[PDB]
Amino acid sequence: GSSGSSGFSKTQRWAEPGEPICVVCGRYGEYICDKTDEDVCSLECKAKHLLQVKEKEEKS
Numbered sequence: 007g008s009s010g011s012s013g014f015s016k017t018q019r020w021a022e023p024g025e026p027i028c029v030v031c032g033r034y035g036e037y038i039c040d041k042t043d044e045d046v047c048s049l050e051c052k053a054k055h056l057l058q059v060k061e062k063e064e065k066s
């Protein structure tokens with residue numbers, strides 16, 4: 007395809023040595039999933055990692 011740009015959020019600031027950090031960006035993970043329990047800053051990052059972890063399992 008081609009896709010476009012991202013939203014207009016700035017919730018990806020530095021993160022102290024202990025807090026969660028985005029697994030796709032690299033700043034902070036204010037949000038955390040349940041199944042994967044990963045860390046993300048926005049909602050797009052969440053699915054961006056989930057749909058990426060599924061293909062990694064292969065099959066099905």
Ligand SMILES: [Zn+2]
Nearest residue numbers: 028031047051
């Ligand atoms: Zn992010």
